[PDB]
Design an enzyme around this catalytic site. Structure first.
Site, mmCIF file in Angstrom:
data_model
loop_
_atom_site.group_PDB
_atom_site.id
_atom_site.type_symbol
_atom_site.label_atom_id
_atom_site.label_comp_id
_atom_site.label_asym_id
_atom_site.label_seq_id
_atom_site.Cartn_x
_atom_site.Cartn_y
_atom_site.Cartn_z
ATOM 1 N N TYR B 508 0.927 -1.152 0.000
ATOM 2 C CA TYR B 508 0.000 0.000 0.000
ATOM 3 C C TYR B 508 0.963 1.197 0.000
ATOM 4 O O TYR B 508 1.214 1.813 -1.055
ATOM 5 C CB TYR B 508 -0.978 -0.023 1.194
ATOM 6 C CG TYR B 508 -1.824 1.218 1.503
ATOM 7 C CD1 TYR B 508 -1.787 2.338 0.687
ATOM 8 C CD2 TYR B 508 -2.600 1.286 2.663
ATOM 9 C CE1 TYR B 508 -2.569 3.463 0.960
ATOM 10 C CE2 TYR B 508 -3.360 2.425 2.965
ATOM 11 C CZ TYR B 508 -3.318 3.517 2.117
ATOM 12 O OH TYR B 508 -4.055 4.640 2.383
ATOM 13 N N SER B 591 -4.357 0.671 -6.195
ATOM 14 C CA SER B 591 -4.520 2.104 -5.850
ATOM 15 C C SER B 591 -3.159 2.754 -5.567
ATOM 16 O O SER B 591 -2.263 2.659 -6.431
ATOM 17 C CB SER B 591 -5.491 2.286 -4.658
ATOM 18 O OG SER B 591 -6.610 1.402 -4.678
ATOM 19 N N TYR B 592 -2.951 3.378 -4.354
ATOM 20 C CA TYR B 592 -1.612 3.906 -4.061
ATOM 21 C C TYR B 592 -0.574 2.764 -4.148
ATOM 22 O O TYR B 592 0.553 2.981 -4.607
ATOM 23 C CB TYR B 592 -1.570 4.511 -2.634
ATOM 24 C CG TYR B 592 -0.421 5.481 -2.444
ATOM 25 C CD1 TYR B 592 0.896 5.019 -2.275
ATOM 26 C CD2 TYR B 592 -0.636 6.860 -2.449
ATOM 27 C CE1 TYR B 592 1.966 5.915 -2.160
ATOM 28 C CE2 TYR B 592 0.428 7.760 -2.299
ATOM 29 C CZ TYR B 592 1.720 7.278 -2.180
ATOM 30 O OH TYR B 592 2.763 8.158 -2.019
ATOM 31 N N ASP B 669 -13.748 3.433 -13.658
ATOM 32 C CA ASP B 669 -13.189 3.859 -12.376
ATOM 33 C C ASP B 669 -13.362 5.373 -12.269
ATOM 34 O O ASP B 669 -12.734 6.145 -12.990
ATOM 35 C CB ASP B 669 -11.720 3.395 -12.298
ATOM 36 C CG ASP B 669 -11.131 3.482 -10.900
ATOM 37 O OD1 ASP B 669 -11.545 4.399 -10.117
ATOM 38 O OD2 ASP B 669 -10.216 2.686 -10.597
ATOM 39 N N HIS B 701 -13.353 1.368 -9.138
ATOM 40 C CA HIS B 701 -12.096 1.194 -8.401
ATOM 41 C C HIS B 701 -12.059 -0.107 -7.585
ATOM 42 O O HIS B 701 -10.977 -0.577 -7.271
ATOM 43 C CB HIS B 701 -11.844 2.433 -7.506
ATOM 44 C CG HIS B 701 -10.405 2.566 -7.097
ATOM 45 N ND1 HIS B 701 -9.396 2.678 -8.051
ATOM 46 C CD2 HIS B 701 -9.844 2.613 -5.863
ATOM 47 C CE1 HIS B 701 -8.254 2.732 -7.368
ATOM 48 N NE2 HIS B 701 -8.478 2.721 -6.051
HETATM 49 N N1 LIG Z 1 -8.976 8.489 -1.967
HETATM 50 C C1 LIG Z 1 -7.995 8.295 -0.887
HETATM 51 C C2 LIG Z 1 -7.520 6.804 -0.808
HETATM 52 C C3 LIG Z 1 -6.856 6.536 -2.191
HETATM 53 C C4 LIG Z 1 -7.481 5.749 -3.210
HETATM 54 C C5 LIG Z 1 -6.885 5.628 -4.458
HETATM 55 C C6 LIG Z 1 -5.667 6.244 -4.772
HETATM 56 C C7 LIG Z 1 -5.045 7.036 -3.797
HETATM 57 C C8 LIG Z 1 -5.644 7.171 -2.525
HETATM 58 C C9 LIG Z 1 -8.717 5.832 -0.510
HETATM 59 C C10 LIG Z 1 -9.428 6.144 0.847
HETATM 60 C C11 LIG Z 1 -8.452 6.119 2.069
HETATM 61 O O1 LIG Z 1 -9.222 6.713 3.162
HETATM 62 C C12 LIG Z 1 -8.588 6.560 4.465
HETATM 63 C C13 LIG Z 1 -9.573 6.862 5.570
HETATM 64 C C14 LIG Z 1 -9.657 8.047 6.204
HETATM 65 C C15 LIG Z 1 -10.641 8.334 7.323
HETATM 66 C C16 LIG Z 1 -11.997 7.914 7.287
HETATM 67 C C17 LIG Z 1 -12.870 8.197 8.362
HETATM 68 C C18 LIG Z 1 -12.394 8.906 9.483
HETATM 69 C C19 LIG Z 1 -11.045 9.311 9.538
HETATM 70 C C20 LIG Z 1 -10.172 9.027 8.462
HETATM 71 C C21 LIG Z 1 -7.093 6.851 1.790
HETATM 72 C C22 LIG Z 1 -6.502 6.569 0.366
#
Ligand SMILES: NC[C@]1(c2ccccc2)CC[C@H](OC/C=C/c2ccccc2)CC1
Ligand SMILES: *[C@@H]1O[C@H](CO)[C@@H](O[C@@H]2O[C@H](CO)[C@@H](O[C@H]3O[C@H](CO[C@H]4O[C@H](CO)[C@@H](O)[C@H](O)[C@@H]4O)[C@@H](O)[C@H](O[C@H]4O[C@H](CO)[C@@H](O)[C@H](O)[C@@H]4O)[C@@H]3O)[C@H](O)[C@H]2NC(C)=O)[C@H](O)[C@H]1NC(C)=O
Ligand SMILES: NC[C@]1(c2ccccc2)CC[C@H](OC/C=C/c2ccccc2)CC1
Ligand SMILES: *[C@@H]1O[C@H](CO)[C@@H](O)[C@H](O)[C@H]1NC(C)=O
Ligand SMILES: *[C@@H]1O[C@H](CO)[C@@H](O)[C@H](O)[C@H]1NC(C)=O
Ligand SMILES: *[C@@H]1O[C@H](CO)[C@@H](O)[C@H](O)[C@H]1NC(C)=O
Ligand SMILES: *[C@@H]1O[C@H](CO)[C@@H](O)[C@H](O)[C@H]1NC(C)=O
Ligand SMILES: *[C@@H]1O[C@H](CO)[C@@H](O)[C@H](O)[C@H]1NC(C)=O
Ligand SMILES: *[C@@H]1O[C@H](CO)[C@@H](O)[C@H](O)[C@H]1NC(C)=O
Ligand SMILES: *[C@@H]1O[C@H](CO)[C@@H](O)[C@H](O)[C@H]1NC(C)=O
Ligand SMILES: *[C@@H]1O[C@H](CO)[C@@H](O)[C@H](O)[C@H]1NC(C)=O
Ligand SMILES: *[C@@H]1O[C@H](CO)[C@@H](O)[C@H](O)[C@H]1NC(C)=O
Ligand SMILES: *[C@@H]1O[C@H](CO)[C@@H](O)[C@H](O)[C@H]1NC(C)=O
Ligand SMILES: *[C@@H]1O[C@H](CO)[C@@H](O)[C@H](O)[C@H]1NC(C)=O
Ligand SMILES: *[C@@H]1O[C@H](CO)[C@@H](O)[C@H](O)[C@H]1NC(C)=O
Lengths: 733, 727
Positions: B508, B591-592, B669, B701
């Site tokens: 990740y 994803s990342y 996506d 996605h």
């Molecule tokens: N779009 C961003 C994310 C992403 C996908 C695709 C490419 C790059 C990156 C996907 C979601 C993720 O969320 C983390 C959660 C945070 C949270 C939630 C509730 C309360 C407090 C904190 C982080 C990476």
């Protein structure tokens, strides 16, 4: 010796030399040599420099192409070329004055010009810019605007829309000058209600948001473009008033429903012929229209109409054939399907509806090449009864039994496939032999058919190929139901009939296709046979061309049936020959060939181990109206919807569990939309079938950019070699 | 014995049992069992039927979910569920009166409702339909329309737009009822000038022309949505006049430029707190706003405004943390990064700007779970100094030295990762242990932290797994530059350290990620280790979370650098351990993780033979503004354009000649656009690199439809098995 490698194919190591000439009169031609334009005397072969190569480096831009005016006074220089579809493109243009020896910098042809053409005599110009027609009487003078209705994606004046470009005219131009340049005829297309195909275009990595390309494109059964036809007199144009275009309307037998304009041919300075085709493409009408000095209009006498219909299929090979008029314009010759279903030359009087066939037999006339007061010259596949051969013949107009073959016996082992280029009044002709040996270009005089000289014999290539283990080509036939069906095989060097080779079936198999012929090619199949010891075979089954309508019309209203079954049967027959490893038979094809490959792989035949479909059609409702409906009719319950629904690749998804499949498609394919492969993949995922895929970002139907072309053939070569248990080789990087 | 196969993973043969309860008071909870809803007494464990599974047999629609009103008088029945993005969806709703045994047939909640919620007490309802807010005081009475400006893709009242849903609130709702339901607060987003991402959607094969989907989506540096905040009094609504919403404006320190609304938390019946974040996400302001009974307005005094800024990175793990107010609303607790860069609980008085840290140490508080009159309950990774563990603690409000670990010693070999669910006033709590052993759910009384009973111990799954050769999991660390970096390995059954195994690095590696932990999982890695004898490793390097800002902020303004280099170093260190076949090391991620996999494969390290990137980011200018700019700043010459241009996958294309790569992406996506992989493939074609690809028509996605999910894992398994020469 070395073999013909994949790098040889991709880097064009072994180049076929051409001899592209441009006739400028009945005795001289232009030929580009070491970037200079030379003028040659056909009788003696002497030349003079017409335009020095240095002139092309005077402008600061790279010149894409040139066009010398028919009177030789001006040169049109094309640059900033930007490709659109198969034939269309836009470019900038400059005109260079050859007598004043200076570039014309005033009243220039605009940038982003869609089409330009000189008049056939003199130096008038007609061009299309922003979908409107303009005429320049002199290259340095202001243009006269002919049309004012042009509108991007909606109204097209003097240029075709997507479907007319691809399927009807095979050209972007929809302008036809009269023989001496007095009149300019043109079509106008109206795409107002035509639906749009929309797809993403990603562009350079710097583009933050992808672009959505939107093209008016009628899929099967959808609303089609409408067409109008006009003629303008270019000798009576005014700087004070707008130009008057005279409309020529379609006959009422066409106006009753949807129709197409399918041919425009000038007969004389004051007579034009037009052919119209119904949307149900088995009925066409030719109109013959004469200029009327008293009204300034064009009269299409009802008594001069000619009907051409088909009870077994569609009209023409792909469209109704072009007429070839006698000098006086009172009679014409045209290729027509005869009573036995073979395409032959028919002679018509413009006022009489029954034509007379001047050729006959179980073979076909391919094209009419020249017409003089004494002879008609044509290409046919009569010689040795080989449908995949081509030769030039001449027939005496005063006695039809007096037929002479001009090319058959010149070099019968080397040359069995000819095309021809005649001088302005046919005093000379260039013959172009394209196989089975190396291409050979020769010049001849018509008076007594004397050979004058060899223009290009590819001796340089012959010397290079003597040091390469080249494959051989076999052209033969199998008999099925007392009918000959032809095939070709590209055979590995030192071919041994006692050994078992893997076999790749290279398929097209679309209506009027011909994949078994006498042409010499250097292509991917040459590498597969030369280096990888794979036999590459092709077969012309039901629906194939140049062998009569009983074969060609066999798939009428039934695409995805007999032509698919016949490829499977051919592969079974190749197994019956004894030198084929039945455990290593593959199939591949592009476009219609991708559709047939996919239908074969989904047949459950058990014949094929693997196959590759490149940009395949998957369902006929996704393809364009003009091509699809020609063979399938309309996708309505009252017409042929049941067969449209029964002939999809998706319905065969479960059977792909038995084979290894590679599906490839360009994302910017404007022709066979990426949608078609997106629906195949979704159907395979839905039934749990594993397969291999490759998309090509921003590539179109040709997957023809230098890098994508190298990449696709490299990827396909790895796939076939793995299917066939052939070894790999390391490379430094 | 049999192994854990790919079909076991794809068909969910071995199911983890849960115990999902819903607290209804301080003493009782609801639990759905055999479609019946039971009410349990937490003290004794006895139950009664709350709602029988036969009540809705004649309903006529398949029910997706339910929501009982807080007073227990009504039940909302959700059906016709249609998914939108990660959180958003639309549905139809019916209301059933639990006392009268009647379905409400008049003044119903409309079809295609975007969001619906009961008030926190009683049975008022607020819903969003066609981007406008409506309130129903009683379920059988007409709705009051609150907003009239809602417009598809342009004005969003009470619901988030794409970027606020994904990156700010992690929710579609943008409605917040006050504690007793008097007021309804809501945000309004305006996407007028936000550019649209456009992509084709092919649909069923019967669709003759593909559809173009168009979504307002701000990519890095693009025009963002604007936001406004309002509060309406639901007790003074009229059928004769339109509702008056009172606007609460952002502070002037935010209005000077682009900003975001990032948190809404009610403090009391008449006090609301809002947190705002600048578009350059290292400065945040909390306003504490009070209702003025004399004017009907909401005032945010500067005496109660709190600033939170970061000099080394952005604010918060992903966003500023939520405050937890005391009942009187005069003080609050909030997780803040301390002077040493570790996130700890700070205590604030609303009118005092210096907070007092109540926890400290080289570990972090994960979340504040409950705040009572006497204790604050929180989850941290303090125990045994393991950043990948989670335990529940309590701290006495009057004495910060009085700390008790509530879960650490309950079952230390089986349970090292807990979450919790407290009753309404925290008299009871359910602990949920998710690993390293089988998940275990237990009930406790907070009176003296005594265990009441085991709710679910997964004994059925344990019996099934005794007949299977299951993999094991190792969690440990390597030392680099005197810093511990943690890793985990899923090890094949009968693991022999004297033998060399192929290794797959599961990545990740995004900011604040954690892939080395004590959680028990049954996933693709379980099959690869159990059946295919592959070691599946993960490593938390620079940029990873829950270990302090010196590690997390190491990649500030520099994505695609240290987190990429540290995955390569981990694979080198795994080779140094002795049981890894250095000729068979692969890497994969989604994803990342797809971005990092691609950057690693393009590094020229020579460590990896092959890898798979699923829906990867390829260039930060293609990803959304809120997430990307948080770490990268703006893609301008004056800010960080040079690093945006230096951190792309495309620039590394020539180095892919050294590896076998499989690139996979769903065509629909909406999140990481197919564009990102379309640009990777074009760059690889342009330099003559052969590679493997797979698109998934109309998948997003998640590539999560039943058929696509089975297909992608089958395709990836064939690829890894061919790379590793496994039959
Ligand atoms: N779009 C961003 C994310 C992403 C996908 C695709 C490419 C790059 C990156 C996907 C979601 C993720 O969320 C983390 C959660 C945070 C949270 C939630 C509730 C309360 C407090 C904190 C982080 C990476
Ligand atoms: C789990 O088990 C618990 C233990 O039984 C349940 O709690 C019990 O709930 C009932 C119903 O709510 C309570 O019932 C009656 O309580 C008093 C008398 O209480 C005394 O006797 C009880 C035994 O009968 C003892 O349990 C008590 O400790 C005490 O000594 C009555 O006066 C009530 O009468 C009133 O209400 C009823 C309706 O409920 C009317 O019909 C009457 O006319 C009158 O108005 C109740 O009958 C009981 O007290 C309570 N026991 C407790 C808490 O100790 C619990 O409900 C259950 N939970 C679930 C979810 O199943
Ligand atoms: N779109 C149709 C074609 C096609 C592609 C993709 C899927 C299906 C089918 C491509 C072009 C081709 O053209 C034939 C030439 C006709 C012609 C030209 C000049 C004079 C007389 C006749 C036939 C198949
Ligand atoms: C060729 O030679 C003849 C003289 O024999 C001359 O008249 C003619 O112009 C020459 N043509 C060219 C193109 O050099
Ligand atoms: C064509 O484009 C160039 C570049 O913008 C411009 O300089 C030139 O004047 C244009 N030519 C015409 C004929 O408009
Ligand atoms: C084009 O066709 C539409 C009908 O589809 C009609 O409204 C319009 O007038 C036409 N335009 C021209 C210039 O003929
Ligand atoms: C020519 O036609 C155009 C378009 O209808 C019009 O704008 C223009 O005024 C006309 N010119 C003359 C000279 O009538
Ligand atoms: C061209 O043809 C037209 C139409 O018959 C005629 O008027 C004109 O004179 C011809 N041109 C020449 C040069 O003869
Ligand atoms: C043309 O095709 C249609 C559809 O098969 C048919 O009904 C019609 O009779 C055909 N016309 C001719 C000339 O045979
Ligand atoms: C929801 O849709 C169904 C189906 O059309 C309809 O019967 C019902 O009345 C609708 N409900 C509301 C509240 O409009
Ligand atoms: C939304 O913002 C635009 C400017 O981007 C503005 O014109 C419009 O009035 C705003 N709409 C509302 C309802 O605030
Ligand atoms: C409420 O506002 C809407 C939208 O502006 C308007 O159409 C309606 O007339 C208003 N109703 C009253 C009672 O003011
Ligand atoms: C809810 O709080 C508001 C604001 O203080 C108050 O006016 C209202 O009466 C309270 N409701 C109840 C049921 O106490
Ligand atoms: C916020 O970040 C920007 C960009 O790095 C920087 O100029 C500014 O000083 C930062 N603020 C703090 C408090 O570090
Ligand atoms: C360790 O320190 C060296 C020297 O400063 C640095 O180059 C390297 O990136 C560091 N590695 C870590 C922190 O993993």
């Amino acid at each position: 010796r070395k073999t013909y490698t994949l790098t040889d194919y991709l880097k064009n190591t072994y180049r076929l030399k051409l001899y592209s000439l441009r006739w400028i009169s009945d005795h001289e031609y232009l030929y580009k040599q070491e970037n200079n334009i030379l003028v040659f005397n056909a009788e003696y072969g002497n030349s003079s420099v017409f335009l020095e190569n240095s002139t092309f480096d005077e402008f600061g831009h790279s010149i894409n192409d040139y066009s010398i005016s028919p009177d030789g006074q001006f040169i049109l220089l094309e640059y900033n070329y930007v490709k659109q579809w198969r034939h269309s493109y836009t470019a900038s243009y400059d005109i260079y004055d050859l007598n004043k020896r200076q570039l014309i910098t005033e009243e220039r042809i605009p940038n982003n010009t869609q089409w330009v053409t000189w008049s056939p005599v003199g130096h008038k110009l007609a061009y299309v810019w922003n979908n409107d027609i303009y005429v320049k009487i002199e290259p340095n003078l202001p243009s006269y605007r002919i049309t004012w209705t042009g509108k991007e994606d909606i109204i097209y004046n003097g240029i075709t829309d997507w479907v007319y470009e691809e399927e009807v005219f095979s050209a972007y131009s929809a302008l036809w000058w009269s023989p001496n340049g007095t009149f300019l005829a043109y079509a106008q297309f109206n795409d107002t209600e035509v639906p749009l195909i929309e797809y993403s275009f990603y562009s350079d990595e710097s583009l933050q948001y992808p672009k959505t390309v939107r093209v008016p494109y009628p899929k099967a059964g959808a609303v089609n473009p409408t067409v109008k036809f006009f003629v303008v007199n270019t000798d009576s144009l005014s700087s004070v008033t707008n130009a008057t275009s005279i409309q020529i309307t379609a006959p009422a037998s066409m106006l009753i429903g949807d129709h197409y304009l399918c041919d425009v041919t000038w007969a004389t300075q004051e007579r034009i012929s037009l052919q119209w085709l119904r949307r149900i493409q088995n009925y066409s009408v030719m109109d013959i229209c004469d200029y009327d000095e008293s009204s300034g209009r064009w009269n299409c006498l009802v008594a001069r109409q000619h009907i051409e219909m088909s009870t077994t299929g569609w009209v023409g090979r792909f469209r109704p054939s072009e007429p070839h008029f006698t000098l006086d314009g009172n009679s014409f010759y045209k290729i027509i399907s005869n009573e036995e279903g073979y395409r032959h030359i028919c002679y018509f009087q413009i006022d009489k509806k029954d034509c007379t066939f001047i050729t006959k037999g179980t073979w076909e006339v391919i094209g009419i090449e020249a017409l003089t007061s004494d002879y008609l010259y044509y290409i046919s596949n009569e010689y040795k009864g080989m449908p995949g051969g081509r030769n030039l013949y001449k027939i005496q107009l005063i006695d039809y039994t007096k037929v002479t073959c001009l090319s058959c016996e010149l070099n019968p082992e080397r040359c069995q496939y000819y095309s021809v280029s005649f001088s302005k009044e046919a005093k000379y002709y260039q013959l172009r032999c394209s196989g089975p040996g190396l291409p050979l270009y020769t010049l001849h005089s018509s008076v007594n058919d004397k050979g004058l000289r060899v223009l290009e014999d590819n001796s340089a290539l012959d010397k290079m190929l003597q040091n390469v283990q080249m494959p051989s080509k076999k052209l033969d036939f199998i008999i099925l139901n007392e009918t000959k069906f032809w095939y070709q095989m590209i055979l590995p060097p030192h071919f041994d009939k006692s050994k078992k080779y893997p076999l790749l079936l290279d398929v097209y198999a679309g209506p009027c296709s011909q994949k078994a012929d006498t042409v010499f090619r250097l292509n991917w199949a040459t590498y597969l046979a030369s280096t990888e010891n794979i036999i590459v075979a092709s077969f012309d089954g039901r629906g194939s061309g140049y062998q009569g309508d009983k074969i060609m019309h066999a798939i009428n209203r039934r695409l995805g049936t007999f032509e698919v079954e016949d490829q499977i049967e051919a592969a079974r027959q190749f197994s019956k020959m004894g030198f084929v490893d039945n455990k290593r038979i593959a199939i591949w094809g592009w476009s219609y060939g991708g559709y047939v490959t996919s239908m074969v792989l989904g047949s459950g035949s058990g014949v094929f181990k693997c196959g590759i479909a490149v940009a395949p059609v998957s369902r006929w409702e996704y393809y364009d109206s003009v091509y699809t409906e020609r063979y399938m009719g309309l996708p309505t319950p009252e017409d042929n919807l049941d067969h449209y629904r029964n002939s999809t690749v998706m319905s065969r998804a479960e059977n792909f569990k038995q084979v290894e499949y590679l599906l490839i498609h360009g994302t910017a394919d404007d022709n066979v939309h990426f949608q078609q492969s997106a629906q195949i993949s979704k159907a395979l995922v839905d039934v749990g079938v594993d397969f291999q895929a490759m998309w090509y970002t921003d590539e179109d139907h040709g997957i023809a950019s230098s890098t994508a072309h190298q990449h696709i053939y490299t990827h396909m070569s790895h796939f076939i070699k793995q299917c066939f248990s052939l070894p790999a080789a390391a490379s430094w990087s």
